Design an enzyme around this catalytic site. Structure first.
Site, mmCIF file in Angstrom:
data_model
loop_
_atom_site.group_PDB
_atom_site.id
_atom_site.type_symbol
_atom_site.label_atom_id
_atom_site.label_comp_id
_atom_site.label_asym_id
_atom_site.label_seq_id
_atom_site.Cartn_x
_atom_site.Cartn_y
_atom_site.Cartn_z
ATOM 1 N N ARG A 57 17.934 -114.112 -51.455
ATOM 2 C CA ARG A 57 18.158 -114.100 -52.898
ATOM 3 C C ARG A 57 18.892 -115.396 -53.268
ATOM 4 N NH1 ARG A 57 22.515 -111.848 -57.135
ATOM 5 N NH2 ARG A 57 21.078 -111.430 -58.875
ATOM 6 N N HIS B 182 17.562 -118.168 -55.838
ATOM 7 C CA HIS B 182 18.328 -118.525 -57.033
ATOM 8 C C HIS B 182 18.728 -119.987 -57.149
ATOM 9 C CE1 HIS B 182 19.594 -114.555 -59.139
ATOM 10 N NE2 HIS B 182 18.442 -114.375 -58.526
ATOM 11 N N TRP C 180 14.387 -100.570 -53.433
ATOM 12 C CA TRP C 180 12.956 -100.545 -53.751
ATOM 13 C C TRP C 180 12.202 -99.805 -52.648
ATOM 14 C CZ3 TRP C 180 15.831 -105.138 -54.446
ATOM 15 C CH2 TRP C 180 15.800 -105.692 -55.756
HETATM 16 C C1 ZNH Z 1 10.635 -111.733 -62.027
HETATM 17 C C2 ZNH Z 1 11.681 -112.150 -61.244
HETATM 18 C C3 ZNH Z 1 12.812 -111.557 -60.620
HETATM 19 C C4 ZNH Z 1 13.889 -110.857 -61.106
HETATM 20 C C5 ZNH Z 1 14.526 -110.660 -62.473
HETATM 21 C C6 ZNH Z 1 14.713 -110.455 -60.056
HETATM 22 C C7 ZNH Z 1 15.836 -109.600 -60.194
HETATM 23 C C8 ZNH Z 1 16.677 -109.106 -59.244
HETATM 24 C C9 ZNH Z 1 17.794 -108.243 -59.482
HETATM 25 C C10 ZNH Z 1 18.184 -107.587 -60.831
HETATM 26 C C11 ZNH Z 1 18.347 -108.064 -58.247
HETATM 27 C C12 ZNH Z 1 19.621 -107.319 -57.863
HETATM 28 C C13 ZNH Z 1 20.940 -108.059 -57.798
HETATM 29 C C14 ZNH Z 1 22.057 -107.192 -57.272
HETATM 30 O O1 ZNH Z 1 22.699 -107.585 -56.272
HETATM 31 O O2 ZNH Z 1 22.285 -106.116 -57.861
HETATM 32 C C15 ZNH Z 1 17.540 -108.767 -57.309
HETATM 33 C C16 ZNH Z 1 17.712 -108.785 -55.929
HETATM 34 C C17 ZNH Z 1 16.983 -109.435 -54.947
HETATM 35 N N1 ZNH Z 1 15.924 -110.257 -55.233
HETATM 36 ZN ZN1 ZNH Z 1 15.053 -110.562 -57.059
HETATM 37 N N2 ZNH Z 1 14.245 -110.945 -58.896
HETATM 38 C C18 ZNH Z 1 13.108 -111.627 -59.193
HETATM 39 C C19 ZNH Z 1 12.386 -112.313 -58.229
HETATM 40 C C20 ZNH Z 1 12.595 -112.400 -56.833
HETATM 41 C C21 ZNH Z 1 11.953 -113.369 -55.925
HETATM 42 C C22 ZNH Z 1 10.900 -114.424 -56.372
HETATM 43 C C23 ZNH Z 1 12.582 -113.185 -54.665
HETATM 44 C C24 ZNH Z 1 12.637 -113.963 -53.472
HETATM 45 C C25 ZNH Z 1 11.640 -114.646 -52.864
HETATM 46 C C26 ZNH Z 1 13.539 -112.096 -54.875
HETATM 47 C C27 ZNH Z 1 14.422 -111.595 -53.906
HETATM 48 C C28 ZNH Z 1 15.498 -110.719 -54.029
HETATM 49 C C29 ZNH Z 1 16.290 -110.142 -52.954
HETATM 50 C C30 ZNH Z 1 16.019 -110.300 -51.459
HETATM 51 C C31 ZNH Z 1 17.221 -109.338 -53.525
HETATM 52 C C32 ZNH Z 1 18.210 -108.398 -52.817
HETATM 53 C C33 ZNH Z 1 19.584 -109.014 -52.634
HETATM 54 C C34 ZNH Z 1 20.647 -108.051 -52.120
HETATM 55 O O3 ZNH Z 1 20.323 -106.904 -51.736
HETATM 56 O O4 ZNH Z 1 21.827 -108.464 -52.111
HETATM 57 N N3 ZNH Z 1 13.549 -111.670 -56.175
HETATM 58 N N4 ZNH Z 1 16.538 -109.410 -57.941
#
Ligand code: ZNH
Ligand code: HEM
EC number: 1.11.1.5
Lengths: 294, 108
Positions: free
Chosen positions: A48, A52, A191
């Site tokens: 993540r 980002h 999820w």
């Molecule tokens: C349409 C668009 C979109 C949106 C608004 C989102 C949203 C979101 C939210 C609200 C969260 C939670 C934060 C906390 O710590 O509480 C997350 C987580 C998240 N995410 Zn993601 N994403 C997305 C795309 C995505 C992509 C393209 C990838 C890669 C390749 C991802 C991978 C992710 C991971 C591996 C996680 C987990 C982290 C932890 O557990 O610490 N994702 N994400």
């Protein structure tokens, strides 16, 4: 007076073996600090983090993206949509003291690649060359996507990262990893069941389960299944859109295809906005801890 | 044995956090992503009572004792290749002993 060209410059006298040591170090710490987030580990938060820092790119003017490593500056660090990522940054600082030569951008992106490979995901080709840039090239807050939206928003949000329909459905499959934390984002729950191992569970859950729209404790709406899983509105929008839906069904049937498109897409996500001169080395494929006997 | 024996309170939290999303331990258990593991010790693999296992889990057909179970939980796909148990592995021996000690007690 002319647009931004971000030229990739390999860290002075560094090569594959140098970078394989930084990977090993991240990968081992992933194995040892396994208690985090009720035993999910640092894997999900590192991918993540990789996303980002890359998600801030804007193809139009070439601002943002992985290159500059500008996540280290308080403006981007304190971005409300980067909440929870400090834990990922904290995990990487002891490793950065160990290897002070590697750039910040190179470390955050490697952290994401390492996490995916370690969590049994596909091998993701990686490249070095990101150079740390000043505090003034730090992108303004708000360039990352909002979760409370539909397919239309997702299609056009990703046009900014130069991603097509196939790429965005593939990249979203990364949500088979970890969970949503109400304290960080206003949404709560996973999820899927296998939160720390990379599979196509995301897509299988999306169309096989029974989804009911409900409100959580932060007053936001999210789709909940009877099995304890959740889906964000943008995740659910992937089955509402006829075009996104047939790529979700493709990946739910073939994990290999899903493993090949994500790696192409994830690599492309991390390499966005960087110009690699032709003398630059071919992308590295790192060996996992399992491939080294561990 | 070769495998020692640990805390059954620690192993409870390890099961709850790492195995509960897919499994149960109870007498008459709600079959989930994975089988109800009550009465696992002493029985064979692929050994139903109602559940669809992959042919790999059935054909390995090993008696689940504390020792071969520990080797499994270290790396599920190395011990039984082609299995659909999506688990990374308990890489620490204390964690395996703490868990199996709870499991032996919970799946009696
Ligand atoms: C349409 C668009 C979109 C949106 C608004 C989102 C949203 C979101 C939210 C609200 C969260 C939670 C934060 C906390 O710590 O509480 C997350 C987580 C998240 N995410 Zn993601 N994403 C997305 C795309 C995505 C992509 C393209 C990838 C890669 C390749 C991802 C991978 C992710 C991971 C591996 C996680 C987990 C982290 C932890 O557990 O610490 N994702 N994400
Ligand atoms: C520390 C935690 C865990 C323990 C003690 C455990 C233990 C076991 C055992 C002993 C079996 C064999 C059952 C038999 O032969 O009758 C098994 C199978 C299975 N487990 Fe779990 N498991 C754990 C976590 C998981 C997780 C996280 C998932 C779900 C995503 C899962 C999914 C399954 C599945 C689907 C099978 C059937 C495998 C096949 O048919 O190939 N397990 N597990």
């Amino acid at each position: 007076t002319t647009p931004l060209v971000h030229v990739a410059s390999v860290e002075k006298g560094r090569s594959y073996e140098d970078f394989q040591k930084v990977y090993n170090a991240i990968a081992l710490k992933l194995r040892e600090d396994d208690e985090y987030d009720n035993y999910i580990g640092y894997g999900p938060v590192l991918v993540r983090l990789a996303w980002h820092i890359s998600g801030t790119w804007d193809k139009h003017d070439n601002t943002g993206g992985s290159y500059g490593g500008t996540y280290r500056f308080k403006k981007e660090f304190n971005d409300p949509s980067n909440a929870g990522l400090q834990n990922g940054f904290k995990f990487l600082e002891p490793i950065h003291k160990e290897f002070p030569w590697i750039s910040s951008g190179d470390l955050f992106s490697l952290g994401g690649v390492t996490a995916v490979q370690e969590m049994q995901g596909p091998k993701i080709p990686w490249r070095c060359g990101r150079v740390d840039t000043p505090e003034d090239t730090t992108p303004d807050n708000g360039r990352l996507p909002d979760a409370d939206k539909d397919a239309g928003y997702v299609r056009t949000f990703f046009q900014r990262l130069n991603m097509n329909d196939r790429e965005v459905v593939a990249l979203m499959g990364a949500h088979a990893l970890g969970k949503t934390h109400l304290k960080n984002s206003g949404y709560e729950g996973p999820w899927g069941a296998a939160n720390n191992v990379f599979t196509n569970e995301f897509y299988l859950n999306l169309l096989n389960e029974d989804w009911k729209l409900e409100k959580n404790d932060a007053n936001n709406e999210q789709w909940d299944s009877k099995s304890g899983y959740m889906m964000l509105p943008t995740d659910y929008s992937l089955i509402q859109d006829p075009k996104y839906l047939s790529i979700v069904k493709e990946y739910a049937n073939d994990q290999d295809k899903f493993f090949k498109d994500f790696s192409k897409a994830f690599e492309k996500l991390l390499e966005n906005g960087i110009t690699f001169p032709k003398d630059a080395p071919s992308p590295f494929i790192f060996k996992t801890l399992e491939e080294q006997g561990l | 044995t070769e495998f020692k024996a640990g805390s059954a309170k620690k192993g409870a939290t390890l099961f709850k956090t790492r195995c509960l999303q897919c499994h149960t331990v109870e007498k008459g258990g709600p079959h989930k992503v994975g089988p109800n593991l009550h009465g696992i010790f002493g029985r064979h693999s692929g050994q139903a009572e109602g559940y669809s296992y992959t042919d790999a889990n059935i054909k390995k057909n090993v008696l689940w004792d504390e020792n071969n179970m520990s080797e499994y939980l270290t790396n599920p796909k190395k011990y039984i290749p082609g299995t659909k148990m999506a688990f990374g592995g308990l890489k620490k021996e204390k964690d395996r002993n703490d868990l199996i000690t709870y499991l032996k007690k919970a799946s009696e």
